[PDB]
Amino acid sequence: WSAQDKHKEGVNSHLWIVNRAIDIMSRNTTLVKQDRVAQLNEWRTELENGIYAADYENPYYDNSTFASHFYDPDNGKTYIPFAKQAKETGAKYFKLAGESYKNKDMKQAFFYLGLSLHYLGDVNQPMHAANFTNLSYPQGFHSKYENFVDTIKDNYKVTDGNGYWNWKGTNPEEWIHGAAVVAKQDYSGIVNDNTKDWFVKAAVSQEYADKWRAEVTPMTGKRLMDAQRVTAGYIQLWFDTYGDR
Ligand SMILES: [Zn+2]
Ligand SMILES: [Zn+2]
Ligand SMILES: [Zn+2]
């Protein structure tokens, strides 16, 4: 997903997903300790810096190749042979974040948590779970798609407090892997012969530009909503693990 604005949801789907996930935790009145949301907000600047930094600097964006932002659950690889993938990377910052939290280093903690949330967010994007980059055919579709998502994301907010609590085990990799599995299953709802053909025609036809956007909307809504629920559960897991319990 997009992350073009550091502290604004406008063109930052990653921040939006995290924010909606936190909202889920807030709406939940039976399992969530609200002081957890209080901390996320207290250190929001760092959390957002972490979410944003993933796509703009090393080592996080892998020399502008973003290889660590992809993870195919079937072969466990990213799109570049031998490169680090989203599962191991998301887990990496999840742990570094927890370790800093225990050491009472809150800025360090939430910055790293932000990065981890970013990687978890990416595997919820079908293209990232299928190694479909902006260079994959049709090239350019990846970026155009994620930019489009920003114009409609607000129409798919989860409004209940039902996040996927304890969706997977205690290992963050299980959550990242699990999300990628579901995302990859929805891949054809975004990338198929139709959307490919229409996107190519969108170059010269406004009708086709609207046609591919329309076609991918239903699945986009599904992906966005699941991403919110999974992320909420992931955050809850983080606090349960390192929040002194
Ligand atoms: Zn992204
Ligand atoms: Zn992307
Ligand atoms: Zn990314």
UniProtKB/Swiss-Prot annotation:
Gene label: plc
Ligand binding (Zn(2+) 3): W1, H14, D122
Mutagenesis or variant effect for S188A: In strain: IAM 1208
Family label: Belongs to the bacterial zinc-metallophospholipase C family.
The EC number(s) this enzyme carries: 3.1.4.3
Residue ranges occupied by any Zn-dependent PLC domain in the UniProt entry: 1-245
InterPro entries in the cross-refs: PLipase_C/P1_nuclease_dom_sf (IPR008947), PLPC/GPLD1 (IPR029002), Zn_PLipaseC (IPR001531)
Subunit structure of this chain's protein: Monomer.
Record GO terms (molecular function): phosphatidylcholine phospholipase C activity; zinc ion binding
Swiss-Prot/TrEMBL catalytic activity: a 1,2-diacyl-sn-glycero-3-phosphocholine + H2O = phosphocholine + a 1,2-diacyl-sn-glycerol + H(+)
Sites where the protein binds Zn(2+) 2: H128, H142, E146
A GO BP annotation: killing of cells of another organism
Organism of this sequence: Bacillus cereus
KW tRNA-binding (keyword) present: no
Positions annotated to bind Zn(2+) 1: D55, H69, H118, D122
Cofactor: Zn(2+)
One Pfam family matching this protein: Zn_dep_PLPC
Cofactor descriptive note: Binds 3 Zn(2+) ions per subunit.
Keyword tags: Cytolysis, Hemolysis, Hydrolase, Metal-binding, Signal, Zinc, Zymogen
Name assigned to this protein: Phospholipase C
Role of this protein: Required, with sphingomyelinase, to effect target cell lysis (hemolysis).
